[PDB]
């Protein structure tokens with residue numbers, strides 16, 4: 001019966017808040033508003049959030065709290081045929097850990113290089129620069145902040161592709177180690193410790209965002225950036241691509257299918273209200289990105305005014321925004337050293353809490369499956385983080401970014417789309433919504449409304465299929481800058497993307513072979529829950 | 533047969549005005565539409581203005597409206613481009629290009645004239661020799677530092693020896709250009725003989741010749 | 748305006764191999780109104796391919812092109828050294844007229860180690876109050892090379908002006924010039940100078956040093 005529980009109610013929430021809110025909040029959402037017509041983009045965003053994202057977010061949190069056990073066992077007890085979902089969901093998170101942590105390493109690497117009052121990325125006269133360098137972003141040229149991030153920090157110019165990784169940056173390897181050391185000691189003991197640590201990692205960004213919002217809006221031309229941000233264009237509502245970006249962002253911003261929400265909620269009390277938790281968490285996540293947009297664009301508008309740079313050049317997504325564009329502006333304004341330290345520390349704290357969840361989803365799921373793992377929990381995560389750090393050295397190479405960009409697209413790619421798709425179908429059809437509503441009623445006291453039941457069985461599979469289809473329509477071979485990945489690199493990634501998905505039919509097929517009977521009895525044997 | 537040359541152009545302060553002219557020969561000039569195309573230092577072509585054969589049809593691609601006025605004189609066969617309110621982003625090499633037929637594009641281009649728009653002021657280059665240190669062959673070079681604006685001309689021994697000479701392009705730093713050139717030659721010549729670096733920056737009227745001393 | 752995007756911006760090729768550069772538009776362009784140009788280094792552009800198909804005057808038969816709508820391509824049958832240049836596509840379909848971002852073609856060759864030489868500041872310069880050390884790196888491939896100024900035994904960053912050269916018409920290698928600029932006094936307080944190159948040719952850098960007391 002007994003399993004440990006959170007040491008507080010707030011600890012669970014901030015743990016989920018932290019996991020959900022990451023660099024993608026800062027570096028993708030604000031760009032989507034600018035690109036898709038501003039404040040008008042909130043309309044498809046809100047709708048897709050309402051019908052697509054939150055019901056799926058609600059589902060995992062509900063499933064986790066009810067079955068009270070990790071990802072693999074949860075789907076094992078729910079639909080024994082589909083237990084492979086529990087395997088796919090875990091090793092997806094296992095793949096992400098090989099790359100995602102290198103972003104935090106960059107943040108610390110910048111944070112460490114941020115002790116000085118003359119910032120190294122301001123000037124074009126340094127040793128790592130080239131004639132194409134310009135003080136700020138320009139068409140056809142390279143910014144000083146750019147050449148610092150590539151030719152110095154990453155040393156990416158040493159590499160011709162993914163076939164050549166080059167030497168190993170040991171300043172990066174040190175930064176990566178520190179990250180895992182922080183992760184190890186936080187995640188070491190159960191939620192009695194890691195649950196407390198998130199009080200920093202989750203809250204501290206809001207502290208920095210506050211003082212960066214004040215600093216941002218006070219800059220000359222800050223109001224100009226806000227217009228580039230929220231100025232409504234409703235012509236984009238008719239555009240199908242906008243509905244795809246809104247649907248994709250909503251789905252990825254709150255992650256289902258890493259088993260994290262499933263694991264995190266599994267430590268909640270049975271009669272805890274997980275419906276209010278899902279609503280509170282989802283809102284804060286969306287609210288964070290909205291606020292973060294003001295921070296970015298007030299500074300982006302400051303650049304387009306006083307620094308005389310095109311808004312098209314400085315408006316960007318991905319790591320390029322926070323590691324190049326944004327620090328370039330910081331250096332220009334007074335007390336630059338202060339804004340630099342809190343920003344790169346914020347980036348680090350934005351990465352850590354997320355990494356906590358992803359790893360915890362692996363630990364908890366393997367702890368409930370294999371009893372021997374719960375004993376000597378650290379012996380497991382030491383060997384786990386060792387394997388991560390050893391392979392993580394490849395991310396610390398000169399061709400490290402080429403490796404990072406590969407796993408970013410594939411590991412976390414369509415793998416998780418078809419995984420969550422089978423999650424909704426298994427629950428709402430195979431397991432049934434009647435059972436799911438009955439379970440939720442027994443927990444929070446009341447059953448889900450008619451709205452939530454329709455979304456789960458009908459809207460959500462369409463919602464995910466709508467994204468998956470237009471993702472494949474819009475498929476191109478993986479490329480970065482002018483470098484096109486070799487066809488064996490794309491193939492390797494699809495295996496990484498497929499090694500998860502393949503768990504669904506495999507574990508299903510392997511289970512049928514171990515059951516007695518003709519096809520008709522054994523499949524009702526495998527669709528029978530653990531509560532019978 | 534067909535020849536297009538571009539006159540005018542040079543250093544102009546922001547807000548200033550300048551007029552470019554294009555001399556045409558080898559064809560009937562009144563029968564073809566002319567167009568100004570400028571090339572930015574980033575090596576990226578941008579169309580500016582088109583004028584018809586009779587000059588009754590004018591098209592402006594605009595970062596440029598109302599600042600530029602394209603003109604045509606079919607009597608003397610000259611193409612004019614009048615500029616005003618110039619700023620830094622107007623800095624480029626302006627080409628005089630022709631074509632009448634939109635379906636065939638621009639079939640003939642001129643040599644081009646260079647326009648530099650900056651608040652920076654003209655300075656004279658200080659050129660320096662580079663002495664090697666106390667082999668089958670020896671490398672020697674000439675450093676040209678702190679000048680504006682481009683361009684300068686660098687030759688070795690009054691522009692006699694070609695081979696083994698690498699002239700590096702100028703790089704702008706703090707409104708000042710720095711340039712260098714390397715020449716490799718056998719140690720049988722040097723110091724068998726006298727090597728001389730020849731630098732010319734017409735804008736600043738500074739023409740300098742440097743002798744190389746191993747000391 | 749209709750923006751033309753060319754891929755790829757820089758392309759390396761061995762003579763005799765096929766090459767294809769693509770030109771894509773934001774708006775659909777009439778197949779008759781698209782044109783191509785070749786611009787040699789330090790020279791004026793020249794009409795190369797007009798109306799997506801027909802070659803211009805003087806253009807060898809090795810060149811070809813195809814496309815329609817928002818997608819067009821230029822193809823050279825078998826590349827010769829004479830074909831090294833930057834290629835710009837163009838649309839006349841509607842004003843304002845526009846050019847592609849451009850595709851720069853460069854020749855590939857055997858990897859060559861650089862020849863590094865270090866030059867102390869000429870005393871004629873020291874009288875002016877400045878001191879600048881120059882490091883020449885000549886005849887190497889590929890284009891990207893990295894210089895390190897370590898004045899012994901610490902490395903200095905700022906005050907360094909690097910300049911490459913366009914790809915050459917015969918060796919098909921490159922050359923780079925690193926200039927470390929200081930004042931008179933900072934040159935005096937310190938000991939010796941050194942610039943060396945990390946290249947693909949060798950995992951071990953090529954070092955050049957001279958000391959003021961020798």
Ligand SMILES: CC(C)CCC[C@@H](C)[C@H]1CC[C@H]2[C@@H]3CC=C4C[C@@H](O)CC[C@]4(C)[C@H]3CC[C@]12C
Pocket residue numbers: 042046049050054282283286287290449451
């Ligand atoms: C736009 C940003 C800043 C705020 C995010 C808006 C979110 C929090 C809002 C917008 C639309 C809202 C939803 C509208 C419809 C319903 C159906 C109702 O039976 C339960 C609440 C629920 C599910 C709302 C939850 C909160 C909601 C999703």
Ligand SMILES: CC(C)CCC[C@@H](C)[C@H]1CC[C@H]2[C@@H]3CC=C4C[C@@H](O)CC[C@]4(C)[C@H]3CC[C@]12C
Pocket residue numbers: 009010013014017203206207209210284291
């Ligand atoms: C920087 C400005 C604009 C926004 C600041 C956001 C802060 C104030 C918000 C965002 C998330 C919020 C927290 C979310 C979780 C909980 C759990 C709840 O049981 C107590 C309140 C508490 C602890 C909230 C306190 C206030 C909070 C920290």
Ligand SMILES: OC[C@H]1O[C@H](O[C@H]2[C@H](O)[C@@H](O)[C@H](O)O[C@@H]2CO)[C@H](O)[C@@H](O)[C@@H]1O
Pocket residue numbers: 112113114115116119120171904
């Ligand atoms: O802004 C960075 C400051 O330290 C730099 O040195 C590097 C170098 O890798 C090593 O000394 C250590 O790892 O610290 C930094 C990491 O970038 C330079 O000394 C200067 O750029 C700055 O003082």
Ligand SMILES: COC(=O)[C@H]1[C@@H](OC(=O)c2ccccc2)C[C@@H]2CC[C@H]1N2C
Pocket residue numbers: 019020021022024025093094096097100101252253254255258260354355357358359412
């Ligand atoms: C790479 O996948 C993610 O970034 C997700 C998540 O990250 C992970 O799932 C994860 C898994 C393993 C290691 C690190 C992160 C954090 C936030 C919430 C969803 C999404 N992200 C926006």
Ligand SMILES: [Cl-]
Pocket residue numbers: 024025029249253285286289
């Ligand atoms: Cl978001």
Ligand code: NA
Pocket residue numbers: 018019020021022023349350351352353354355
């Ligand atoms: Na996070």
Ligand code: NA
Pocket residue numbers: 020021022024025252253254285
């Ligand atoms: Na998020």
